[PDB]
Amino acid sequence: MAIGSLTINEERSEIVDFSVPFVETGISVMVARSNGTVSPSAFLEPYSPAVWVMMFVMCLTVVAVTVFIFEYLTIGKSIWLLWALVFNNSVPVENPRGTTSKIMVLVWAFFAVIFLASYTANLAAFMIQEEY
Amino acid sequence: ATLTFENMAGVFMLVAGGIVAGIFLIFIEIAY
Numbered sequence: 001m002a003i004g005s006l007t008i009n010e011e012r013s014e015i016v017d018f019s020v021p022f023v024e025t026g027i028s029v030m031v032a033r034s035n036g037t038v039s040p041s042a043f044l045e046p047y048s049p050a051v052w053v054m055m056f057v058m059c060l061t062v063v064a065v066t067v068f069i070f071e072y073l074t075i076g077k078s079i080w081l082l083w084a085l086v087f088n089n090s091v092p093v094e095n096p097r098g099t100t101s102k103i104m105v106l107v108w109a110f111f112a113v114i115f116l117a118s119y120t121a122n123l124a125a126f127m128i129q130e131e132y
Numbered sequence: 133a134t135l136t137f138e139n140m141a142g143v144f145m146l147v148a149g150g151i152v153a154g155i156f157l158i159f160i161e162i163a164y
């Protein structure tokens with residue numbers, strides 16, 4: 001007997017005999033670790049390109065609603081405040097004195113509070129190098 | 133994980149509902 005690390009083959013099994021194998025053996029390839037990479041995240045992995053076209057829809061059709069109720073009691077100045085509120089409101093503002101729109105914007109304003117939840121929490125983990 | 137268009141439907145009618153409800157109050161406000 002020749003006990004040890006002997007690999008069953010075709011030529012060897014002709015002139016000698018082998019017992020029942022008890023361990024697998026094959027051929028494998030080893031390469032050192034590679035540095036990971038992160039592709040530039042398309043809008044930081046949000047809610048599909050649909051939402052980006054989606055936000056343009058209601059925002060542009062809700063500013064006109066305010067303009068309609070503005071005269072009854074400046075659309076160019078009515079797009080600066082309405083939009084910029086959604087992104088960490090810090091820019092200079094110009095707010096109308098219309099009572100009907102005053103209540104309306106607050107409901108719109110509350111949307112920005114909930115919007116951040118979509119762009120927070122989730123974005124933390126999915127930013128590091130991936131794809132292996 | 134992708135938020136996608138779905139799984140966020142509830143907040144949608146809140147913007148729309150305010151528009152629908154808001155036009156009802158202004159008529160009372162104008163008459164007030």
Ligand SMILES: N[C@@H](CCC(=O)O)C(=O)O
Nearest residue numbers: 004005006007008009025
């Ligand atoms: N030990 C195995 C693999 C060859 C080697 O380890 O050099 C054999 O006897 O065939």
